[PDB]
Design a protein around this ligand. Structure first.
Ligand code: CL
Ligand code: CL
Length: 248
C-alpha cells in the first residue's frame, strides 16, 4: 500500500498473508472457520498446494505474536470461469488444512449478498503488506498498511485506464469488477497487496466488497485499484461453503 498509514494491531482481523515457499505473495480475507478468499491470479495451477501458507492474526509480519496463527491449505479453488490474467472470475477459495479458532485478532469478514450494492464514492479501505512505493518493499517489521479509497465505477475506471494506455500493458475492468482510489497519483495498492480485502462500511458493519484483482499500479495517476466484486460470487461461495462444511 502506497500513501496509506499503519493500521493498529487487530483492526482488520480478517486480513491474512499468503506465502509461497515462505515468501509473502498475496493478501486474503478470512470468511469462515476453514475458508479464505483471495484472488485466482495468486494461484497458478503449476504451483504445489503444499508450498503455500496462510498467516492469520498478524499485524507486523516479522514480529513474533502469540496471537498470530499459521496454516497450510487442504485445497485451492479458483473460480472455474477464471482464464488468463485480466479475465473475469479472479477469485479463489482457499480451504485451510484444519479449521481455525476465532479470536479478537482472527475474525471473518461478512460477505455481501449477490444483490448488495455499494455506491460510487463510498469510502472503503484496502489493506496489505505489499510495496509502500513502486518497486519498494515494506520494511521490517512490516506493519499492516491501510488506505481509505472511494469506490469508482467500472465505467469511469475503464476510461481512466485508457488515458496514456500502453499496448504492452492491456487492462479492462470486467463486469464482475469495481475500482477504488484516486484520479491523481500517490494513493493505492501495490505489488503484494493483491488478493487482499476492500472492506466497506455499511450500516455499522463491514463487508468484503472487493478482492484486489489488479493492485500493481501503486499510485500511478489514472490507475485506481481494480477489484473483483464479492457480490458476483455470493452464490458460488455459499454453495462451496455449505457442501464442504465440517463437523462442529
Ligand atoms: Cl466453514
Ligand atoms: Cl466500460
Amino acid at each position: 500500500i502506497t500513501g496509506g498509514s499503519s493500521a493498529v494491531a487487530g483492526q482488520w482481523p480478517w486480513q491474512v498473508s499468503i506465502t509461497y515457499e515462505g515468501v509473502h505473495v498475496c493478501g486474503g480475507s478470512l470468511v469462515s472457520e476453514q475458508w479464505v478468499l483471495s484472488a485466482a491470479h495468486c494461484f497458478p495451477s503449476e504451483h504445489h498446494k503444499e508450498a503455500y501458507e496462510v498467516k492469520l492474526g498478524a499485524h507486523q509480519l516479522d514480529s513474533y505474536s502469540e496471537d498470530a496463527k499459521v496454516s497450510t491449505l487442504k485445497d485451492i479453488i479458483p473460480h472455474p470461469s477464471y482464464l488468463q490474467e485480466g479475465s473475469q472470475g479472479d477469485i479463489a477459495l482457499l480451504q485451510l488444512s484444519r479449521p481455525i479458532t476465532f479470536s479478537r485478532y482472527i475474525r471473518p469478514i461478512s460477505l455481501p449478498a449477490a444483490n448488495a450494492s455499494f455506491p460510487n464514492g463510498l469510502h472503503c479501505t484496502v489493506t496489505g503488506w505489499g510495496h509502500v512505493a513502486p518497486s519498494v518493499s515494506l520494511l521490517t517489521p512490516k506493519p499492516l498498511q491501510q488506505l481509505e479509497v472511494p469506490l469508482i465505477s467500472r465505467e469511469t475506471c475503464n476510461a481512466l485506464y485508457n488515458i496514456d494506455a500502453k499496448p504492452e500493458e492491456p487492462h479492462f475492468v470486467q463486469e464482475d469488477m469495481v475500482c477504488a482510489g484516486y484520479v491523481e497519483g500517490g494513493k493505492d495498492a501495490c505489488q503484494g497487496d493483491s488478493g487482499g480485502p476492500l472492506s466497506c462500511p455499511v450500516e455499522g458493519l463491514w463487508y468484503l466488497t472487493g478482492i484486489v484483482s489488479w493492485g500493481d499500479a501503486c499510485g500511478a495517476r489514472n490507475r485506481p485499484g481494480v477489484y473483483t466484486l464479492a457480490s458476483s460470487y455470493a452464490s458460488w461461495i455459499q454453495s462451496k461453503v455449505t457442501e464442504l462444511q465440517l463437523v462442529p
